[PDB]
From a paper:
[name] is an 842-amino acid protein that belongs to the B subfamily of the ABC transporter.
We solved the apo-state cryo-EM structure of human hABCB6 in nanodiscs at the resolution of 3.6 Å according to the Fourier shell correlation (FSC) 0.143 criterion. The TMD contains six transmembrane helices, among which TM4 and TM5 insert into the other hABCB6 monomer in the homodimeric transporter. In the apo-state, hABCB6 adopts an inward-facing conformation and TMDs of hABCB6 contain the substrate-binding cavity which is divided into two parts: a closed cavity 2 and an open-form cavity 1, different from the consecutive substrate-binding pocket found in most ABC transporters. The TMD region of hABCB6 contains a loop “plug”, just like a gate, which includes a sequence of “GGGTGSTG” in the middle region of TMD. The “plug” intervening TM2a and TM2b from one monomer interacts with TM5 and TM6 from another monomer of hABCB6, indicating that the “plug” is important for maintaining apo-form conformation and may undergo conformational changes during the transport process. The distance between those two “plugs” is about 6 Å and it is impassable for the substrates such as porphyrin. In the inward-facing conformation, the “plug” within the middle of the TMD region, and the upper constriction sites containing residues Y286 and V531, together forbid the access of substrate translocation.
Residue numbers in the entry:
A (entry chain B), B (entry chain A): 244 to 576, 580 to 827
Amino acid sequence: RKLRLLSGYLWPRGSPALQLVVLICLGLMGLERALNVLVPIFYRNIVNLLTEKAPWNSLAWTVTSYVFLKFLQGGGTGSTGFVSNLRTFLWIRVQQFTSRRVELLIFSHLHELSLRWHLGRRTGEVLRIADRGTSSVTGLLSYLVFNVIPTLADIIIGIIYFSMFFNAWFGLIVFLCMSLYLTLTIVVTEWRTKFRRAMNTQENATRARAVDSLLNFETVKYYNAESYEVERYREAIIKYQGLEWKSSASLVLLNQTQNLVIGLGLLAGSLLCAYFVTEQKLQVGDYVLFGTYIIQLYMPLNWFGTYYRMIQTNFIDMENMFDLLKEETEVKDAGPLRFQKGRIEFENVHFSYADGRETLQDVSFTVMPGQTLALVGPSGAGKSTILRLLFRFYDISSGCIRIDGQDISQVTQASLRSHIGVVPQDTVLFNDTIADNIRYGRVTAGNDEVEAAAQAAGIHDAIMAFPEGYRTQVGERGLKLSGGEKQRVAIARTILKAPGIILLDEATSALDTSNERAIQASLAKVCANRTTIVVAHRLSTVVNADQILVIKDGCIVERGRHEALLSRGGVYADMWQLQQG
Amino acid sequence: RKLRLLSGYLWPRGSPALQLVVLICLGLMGLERALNVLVPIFYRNIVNLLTEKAPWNSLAWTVTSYVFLKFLQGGGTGSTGFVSNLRTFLWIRVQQFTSRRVELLIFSHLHELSLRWHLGRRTGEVLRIADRGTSSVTGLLSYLVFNVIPTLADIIIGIIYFSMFFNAWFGLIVFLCMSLYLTLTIVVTEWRTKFRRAMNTQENATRARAVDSLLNFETVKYYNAESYEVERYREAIIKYQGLEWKSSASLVLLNQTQNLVIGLGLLAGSLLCAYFVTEQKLQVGDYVLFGTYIIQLYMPLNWFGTYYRMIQTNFIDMENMFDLLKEETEVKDAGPLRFQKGRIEFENVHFSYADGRETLQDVSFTVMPGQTLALVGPSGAGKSTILRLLFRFYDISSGCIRIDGQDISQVTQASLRSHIGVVPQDTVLFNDTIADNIRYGRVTAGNDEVEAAAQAAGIHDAIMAFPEGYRTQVGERGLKLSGGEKQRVAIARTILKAPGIILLDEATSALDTSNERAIQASLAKVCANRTTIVVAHRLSTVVNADQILVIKDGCIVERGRHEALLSRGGVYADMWQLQQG
């Protein structure tokens, strides 16, 4: 029901050179379970031969055959022997194939859902639930396959032996001891997680008194305390040293129940075995075959107290990922957009972000190809929201959006935004060379075309004054350049794309008045036959526009050219006279 | 040379009920080294008795005497046995006496040095070097006393035995094997710290590409990439999976050198021992006394590879604390200040913060007792700096400061600031009840006097509108109250102190004009016969002052009363006419 999705990540589903390593690393697990009943048997045989005064020529070939199987097979769990850690040297290339196919299945999925970040608030906690869900599937798989199943199949082949070859009372002793050694490890461990979660609470409430009694050394000197903060940092460090005594003297109780159980299963077994040797039913060596075989049989059952938490944690830390992969796209688009001329039309579009307010109410216009449209108005009117719906980040509630007589909701969204190039309002940059931030528009462009269209952005003479040339660094999100040099890169990128429809949220905000008409005249021989939608707060830029739209609260109050709204005396003429003086 | 200061923290220097536990926990370390040569010897004896067909009545009292010493003495290091973890149940009360005397020796030392925070920039890194230097002395002491010295004295009593009682070639084999098992653990471990410090560098440079390609999902949709961030997150996750293969297949080389050394010291020893038994120089049981005694002799030498770093780290993480405790106070004061009337005098005081600029130049005035002095001027003139030197946070360069004809540099600074009560400019509060923030002035005051002098601060009718009464919470640094309710607590605290000299940096800054003269008239029946120094930017408060001082750049330009500077027409009269309109 839940391991049915885990075992799909065991078999790598492809690349059959890694379908062979899985069979070898499950064939050195079967060899390892047949060396825990060879070495002990060999040891008893040596003891018997020594007792029967065997010749030296027939005894040196059964001592070097024993030490070789003590090299082959492991020691304890401290010195792990050659068969194990050869299925660790070969298992690296199988858990470096599950930690690459899983976190390229969600990172290629967070970019395709919607304009809702990642169905989370910050991406600092969505990439945390993503890197933690990849280091859980691999870990969980490893524990069950190599640490839990082998351990619980090394006791069952240690009860059918001592059942076959011994006196059938020994098997019962082993079963009773091992079961107790296990139900008094799981019970007392989850009785101790009560004690440390009330310990990590207090120690951060003790250390939050030493900090804020030194964040203001400024104030403790006026009233001359200087000792009263010592007599109440002692009184909160003694309260903490009575709640770690209950978590360091409750681990001693755990290591006196795990010791008294294995100190009685080795008493009621050894004494019985000695008696049998006396009755000549067994011999010497079968007493040494019991003291050796028990000690290698409970030490793998000792690190099952760690694994009861790290497996229980990795089912709530693993299904957090597997419904993150089941989140609906919602905005999914169908033939490609057939772009011919660039005629943009809205027909009565209504839009709302979160249904409380209508952001755009009955927005309608028509842009003929080769014409520049101007959007003006106050802040928060809905100006950049129109340039979000044309690019289709968001679905509209009603109405229709047409480009060359074709609805944008019908065609594919990957072909809609190939003819549209928009410079953002506040521009972000990648954390690399600026010659790659400019070529990111059309990535197949050469170095001769990047430098050519960076002349049209007006930054070309500003980069040659820099050291290191075009491949200097911007830092993260372009913060090492400027406010204005950051922005002229974003105009430059759009020109390398050379889109059919050009959109400009903000282009002159951080630039002075001498640098707009160096670009606006340069964009005018770029926007000669290509559709342009511009919106600016400064009002001298949109004088030579073709049609000016005024937006107050998401509703168009008046439209027309520049001279038709100055003689009208509406809200545009009052906005023009307010800026002239 | 450096363990001479470590062994002083072993002996607790007092409380002789914890000078007895140190002798018991060093007497269960001598019992534990004499159970590693009792249990193996007992085991050989049992084997010999079985061979010689001993009677059952004389064999059951040497098997239950063996299992009892396997309960008493430990198992491996996984199931630690009763003698150990009885010097862990008793050692808690000795390392809870060193983790309380050390971090009350530095926390009572950071409040006594100077007005330089803590000779650091932020207290978030001075309390980090302080809590880390306390969890180092205890840890280091434990490792050497209980983990390193016992281990290296359990091999030397395993060479003088096999030297005495065996055939004098065995001792050499043990010495050769153990030494190699140790110089091929220290060498290969510090050959592997090269490989992981170049692994933690790359993994944070891989994970800083997934974050900033999702901090702006805003920008990657315009140029329609959505796959180009996948084809360069794969190309930087394969660069990382070639630098953890060199750190997970160089640990396999460590566990094939620690295995081949102990797989040859148990070959060249066991074969020789078997030969001796054949020559009837030894017997059966002396072959089992060698296979048992080696395996318990290298497993304590296995966790010496962890302890070579955690001890080397704790000498650079420990002497960072022991010159932090050797930092000079510098400003140390001598009889107590004899306060009679409260006559404050400066005689040509000069002062500089960092020797580049003279902050105060030839400041001189005289305040008769029972009079209010006013300081005015622009921002950054040196107004609050005068109220720092009178309280003596800082030593002056030249000149003299006198209170009632007594220099403040001569008397003790703990008696100087008992007659002076200053409200700070921006007021900070403790993170508890507001009835404790008000009683922190005089801590021995009762609840009837806190509520009485909170009436004089004007907050008394504002707290009874709150829920929970006087013991409501302010949060950390008073941010839960207000800007103005935060400040009226700081006036209130000063009144409970009732000092001889009252200082007011800012008292009306966050209060409106209706709440100053509710306090200023209320302070006027508090400041009736007690010296007051006030400084305010609003100029209506200091009209009825006794003497007004004007400070431009740390130099007094003009002084006198209110009417004597309006008729003078100086810089005070131009500052008065600028505020009237």
